[PDB]
Amino acid sequence: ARTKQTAR
Amino acid sequence: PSCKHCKDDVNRLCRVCACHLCGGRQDPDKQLMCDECDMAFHIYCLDPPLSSVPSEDEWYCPECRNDA
Ligand SMILES: [Zn+2]
Ligand SMILES: [Zn+2]
Ligand SMILES: [Zn+2]
Ligand SMILES: [Zn+2]
Known part of the structure; x- marks a missing residue:
């Protein structure tokens, strides 16, 4: 799922 | 502003941005x-709250999800 920000 | x-x-x-x-x-x-309305939801604010981010490609919020 999309998140507002991602680790990568 | 933005x-x-x-x-x-x-x-x-x-609750908008x-x-x-x-x-x-x-x-x-x-x-x-949300892959329908593009609103943001903390995993922990959902009901039921999720302990982690789902793995599946798409996710639909409580307002957009089909009846289970
Ligand atoms: Zn705002
Ligand atoms: Zn939605
Ligand atoms: Zn929240
Ligand atoms: Zn709403």
Whole structure:
């Protein structure tokens, strides 16, 4: 799922 | 500003540009984006709350999801 920000 | 409802004020709640349920901007890494309405939801604000971000490609929020 999309998140507002991602680790990568 | 970017958001006309909160004028981007980091100290203000906004259910439009931040978590749609609590209005909080914290933990963007835990804010799921609805693949229908594009609103953000903390995993922990959902009912039921999720302990982690779902693995599946798409995610639909409580307002958009089909009846289970
Ligand atoms: Zn806003
Ligand atoms: Zn709503
Ligand atoms: Zn929230
Ligand atoms: Zn939605």
